[PDB]
Amino acid sequence: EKWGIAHIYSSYNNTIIHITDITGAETISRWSGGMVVKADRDEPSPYAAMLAARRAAEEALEKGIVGVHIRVRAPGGSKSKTPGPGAQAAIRALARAGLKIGRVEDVTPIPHDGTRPK
Amino acid sequence: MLIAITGTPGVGKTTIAKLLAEKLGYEYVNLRDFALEKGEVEIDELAYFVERNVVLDGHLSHLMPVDLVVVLRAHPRIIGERLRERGYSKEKIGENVEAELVDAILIEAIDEHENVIEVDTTNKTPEEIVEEIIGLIKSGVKRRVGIVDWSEVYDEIIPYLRLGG
Ligand SMILES: Nc1ncnc2c1ncn2[C@@H]1O[C@H](COP(=O)(O)OP(=O)(O)O)[C@@H](O)[C@H]1O
Ligand SMILES: [Mg+2]
């Protein structure tokens, strides 16, 4: 009945899946698109995100994790605000690999200090 | 020529922009001051009011109608150290470090503009950086992006990230 937290980051260049324990102090698994694909150009691919997440999930399951809550960082543009399919693809890959999915929260970071918009 | 200097808070926008205005002989303008003195700030309003040879300094500078955007990058640990030095709260620090990690500003700038030059400031003096920008504008290059991937340093920025459950 051990639950973890999957921290999912979609960037311009890559995708990161970092699974920790419930406290966030202990790292269960850490995988990126860059760890699973050969070519730089494929690192941002949602297929790469899916494979990275599959590896993270398998590691977590081997370590006794039954499920993960999700904390997603998925930045998008200012004009068109589009995060892309990657973060969600990673979540879906976590589920299909055999992890239960708990709370899902969007923590996408907003850079601030300076002028503050409304 | 209107050049935006943008990037995550703590990245060196002000340092680099001032030195750049000096070296190119352009005028330095800080966006915050400008917004206040022209009367929460409204982005559309600010965009009208900005609209000389100007180096424009701010993390909102890429949302303004400029000729060129320079997106400054830095290793998110450097962001973290600097924002600790400023006395930002732990959460505000974590949020900004994560913003740098995920290319938040870069993604915004490429969405807003065609001419975006990304510059990695890491292990460089302000002088080296300004000369790099100059060599690029002089080259002249309108667009360079995708030159840093901070996922590669992820383990190093863990102490700054908002990981607690
Ligand atoms: N290339 C650099 N080398 C060393 N220190 C730097 C460099 N760029 C900026 N700094 C330092 O980092 C701190 C934050 O710089 P600042 O220009 O205020 O960042 P920002 O304007 O992006 O918020 C300043 O104290 C400055 O002295
Ligand atoms: Mg500044």
Residue numbers in the entry:
A (entry chain F): 12 to 129
B (entry chain D): 1 to 39, 49 to 60, 66 to 179
From the paper:
Amongst the factors involved in this maturation step, Fap7 is unusual, as it both interacts with ribosomal protein Rps14 and harbors adenylate kinase activity, a function not usually associated with ribonucleoprotein assembly. Fap7 forms a complex with Rps14 that is conserved between humans, yeast, and archea. We report that Fap7 association blocks the RNA binding surface of Rps14 and, conversely, Rps14 binding inhibits adenylate kinase activity of Fap7. In addition, the affinity of Fap7 for Rps14 is higher with bound ADP, whereas ATP hydrolysis dissociates the complex. These results suggest that Fap7 chaperones Rps14 assembly into pre-40S particles via RNA mimicry in an ATP-dependent manner.
Two crystal forms were obtained for the archaeal aFap7–aRps14 complex bound to ADP/Mg2+ and ATP/Mg2+, which diffracted to 2.1 Å and 2.4 Å, respectively. Phasing was performed by single anomalous diffraction on the ADP/Mg2+ crystal form with platinum-derived crystals diffracting to 4.0 Å (see phasing and refinement statistics in Table 1). Four copies of the Fap7–Rps14 complex are present in the asymmetric unit in both space groups, revealing a 1∶1 complex of aFap7 with aRps14. The structures obtained for aFap7–aRps14 in complex with ADP and ATP show subtle conformational differences. Both nucleotides bind in the aFap7 ATP binding pocket. The ADP-bound state of Rps14-bound aFap7 superposes perfectly with ADP-bound hFap7 for residues of the P-loop and LID domains in the ATP binding pocket (unpublished data). It therefore seems that, in the ADP-bound form, the binding of aRps14 does not lead to major structural changes in the aFap7 LID domain. In the aFap7–Rps14 structure, the C-terminal residues of aRps14 (aRps14-CE) after the final β5 strand forms an unusual interaction with Fap7 that occludes the putative AMP binding site. The Rps14-CE completely fills the cavity lined by residues from the LID, NMP binding, and Walker B domains, and would preclude nucleotide binding. The Rps14-CE forms a lasso-like structure, which creates an extensive interaction surface, contributing 800 Å2 (45% of the total binding surface). Surprisingly, the surface of Rps14 involved in rRNA binding corresponds closely to the interaction surface with Fap7 in the aFap7–aRps14 complex.
